[PDB]
Symmetry: D2
Subunit: 233 residues, 4 copies
């Protein structure tokens, strides 16, 4: 068994790969998106962050896949007289992977057709006519910004959201859940995903987020703590 486990209750940039607007505040928070400087979520911001060490999600010589679980607490805040956009997502991406489109694409996809060998659990705050369900949701994305399945998520501005995502090698079951300790509300989604089919044996694990590309559609995308655990074979 080749295990890996880490838990960050305070972030620091030395063991993180930051891309674009991603940055770690002096207070130890992982801030995925910018500020127009005046303390307001910048428009058209895109930021990604990954753990500096690759994780082996599956082995092609033994044919085994890893089981994993991750939990993190994020906080999305929308400024007065503005709307949430575009969202935040946990993602398993190819090691050297570079950022993609802004806005509705969450920095993870193109809208083109290139195989992104990407799997992500998104927390969509803005409705996109072309592929999104009508209400804000939690979705499991497998190579497309069009979730393979979703669930209604009743977004609450400024409240800490606690997430738990788990993958089981045997059942190929991916389960994502979110709860607002303050609201005592909870949501859960689950579907089967075959990681061998879409992901490369080694992947970089992390977050990606974006703000709307239009003046009044912005939000902050901060992660306050994160823990990941993976067991292979």
């Amino acid at each position: 068994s080749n295990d890996i486990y880490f838990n960050f209750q305070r972030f620091n940039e030395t063991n993180l790969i930051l891309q674009r607007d991603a940055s770690v505040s002096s207070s130890g928070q992982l801030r995925l998106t910018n500020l127009n400087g005046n303390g307001e979520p910048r428009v058209g911001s895109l930021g990604r962050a990954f753990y500096s060490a690759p994780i082996q999600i599956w082995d092609n010589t033994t044919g085994t896949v890893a089981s994993f679980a991750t939990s993190f607490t994020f906080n999305i805040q929308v400024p007065n007289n503005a709307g949430p956009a575009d969202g935040l997502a946990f993602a398993l991406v190819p090691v050297g992977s570079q950022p993609k489109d802004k806005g509705g694409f969450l920095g993870l996809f193109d809208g083109s057709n290139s195989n992104f060998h990407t799997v992500a659990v998104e927390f969509d705050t803005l409705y996109n006519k072309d592929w999104d369900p009508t209400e804000r949701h939690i979705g499991i994305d497998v190579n497309s910004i069009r979730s393979i399945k979703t669930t209604r998520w009743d977004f609450v501005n400024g409240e800490n959201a606690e997430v738990l995502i788990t993958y089981d090698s045997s059942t190929n079951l991916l389960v994502a859940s979110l709860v607002y300790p303050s609201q005592k509300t909870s949501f859960i989604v689950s579907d089967t995903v075959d990681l061998k089919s879409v992901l490369p044996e080694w992947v970089s694990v992390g977050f990606s987020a974006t703000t709307g590309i239009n003046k009044g559609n912005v939000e902050t995308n901060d992660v306050l703590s994160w823990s990941f655990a993976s067991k292979l074979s």
Copy 2:
């Protein structure tokens, strides 16, 4: 920190406290309720099982409460031309605690008024006019068979259900979730519970289950694996 952690992928009666009809099959399964000829769920069956070592859930001298998480896989099967009844539940009970009423009371409650110092997460399969919601559900019970909160549970006969219950000391948040890997369906409930108020410092941890008290209302109540983890202070 006084921790405890165990994981049983196969049960054996030597480190278990069995009550009434509870028993461990030769195949290592924890069978909470009886059977009879042919191999049918006996009517009016009641069985409880606990880990033979007490767990300290909170300390009155330091004022701290433990955080815990448990996960188990159960399988409820209803025989042809019969209906599910009455249910199964994970419960934290007083150490010497003895069984209570059958049927709708799940062997955990009376319907009287005695403080049972019991907290349980139930998986109710039968509707009880007097206190149950109309549909089958998952409920958090705090001293009463009348759940302090519930959620719709779409019961699937004969399919393995995977449960995850977690309690957080800081937020006093109890979260129970269930998923059917085969159906890819999931359900989640959450509410705040102050364990210091209702539970004694030391409790026995385990399961309780019953079958209907009427001819055509029976089911099997088997637990296939179980893991518990508790951290105090």
Copy 3:
């Protein structure tokens, strides 16, 4: 895998089996032997303590043996103008097992010939002509008070000793080590032991200790913290 893990940084009698003079101080310490009011270690004291839940060390149907590790901190104190006696030991004993002889037998053995199905790691403080090496030692005992192997242990009165015992199923290697953080001294012993041959599938895990049976040979035998971990199959 049927795992078990616990860690006590403060003892309490509700999840412990105490035998004879064993007791838990108000300060949360496991005191294996008595005191005589004058504050001095009683003469001819014998006390044993075990975790209230049996542990499965091996399975005769699958032929597998468990790997385990335990660590604890003990403190032996000798009163002025007196000598250490008789010792302290960590032991895996049969579930219902009752105490044996006092003094040099550490409460674990007879000197007769009954198979005790006992395995213990002793911390011998008194020399017994008949079977002990000349100097104080750490010894691995397999069914006899005559250690199957030992190592010189330079006893330091009143200083906290930190112990680590580990057993590996594959290599059948038992390794015991002790260190005095204050003295920066360390000792280690290792030998192979086939647990299937001497131990019953289920055992009670714990400590045993005694004081000399002669006026000026006494000591305190206190355990300050304890953690055990076992993985089967």
Copy 4:
């Protein structure tokens, strides 16, 4: 608490930083030093390997230090009619750290006076008049190839050695032990080390090894498995 834990029972170069002659065999072994025309330890070889993600060993803002433990299995083999040289060592080094001198310096030190902010546990196989004890040993090195303390190590050619190194934040106690499951022999060393004084807050964790710089003094320096665990605050 900012934790980190990994366990490699088979190495792969994608999550490793390899320096000089270090390499990962097709069979998944971390081979620190080179070979020859045929499996002959090359002369004057030097190789180092670290985990690709920095580890935070202490925080200067909170003043806390991390506790850690690592265990690995290495195998040193000397070719017929040749002698062991120079040794192998586990080390905590500065993040960008580059290799140092060959031979007796184990690739970790200079013999000059530059502060290397390095701490290592060495497994010295060759006697160096100037600073080494007469017999082969295990030594704790704090900024100098001259160990701050050592212990006799009875080297056994070609046998797998199992190592366990642990550091305790509270007692500042570093304890290194080695055992030869096949020989049933064991060795242990312990001394206090203040990591804040010598190490930078973030360090790269890994191995370093070298072979003699003279024709008949060579050995292989292979690590077969490795697990590291660190807990900060």
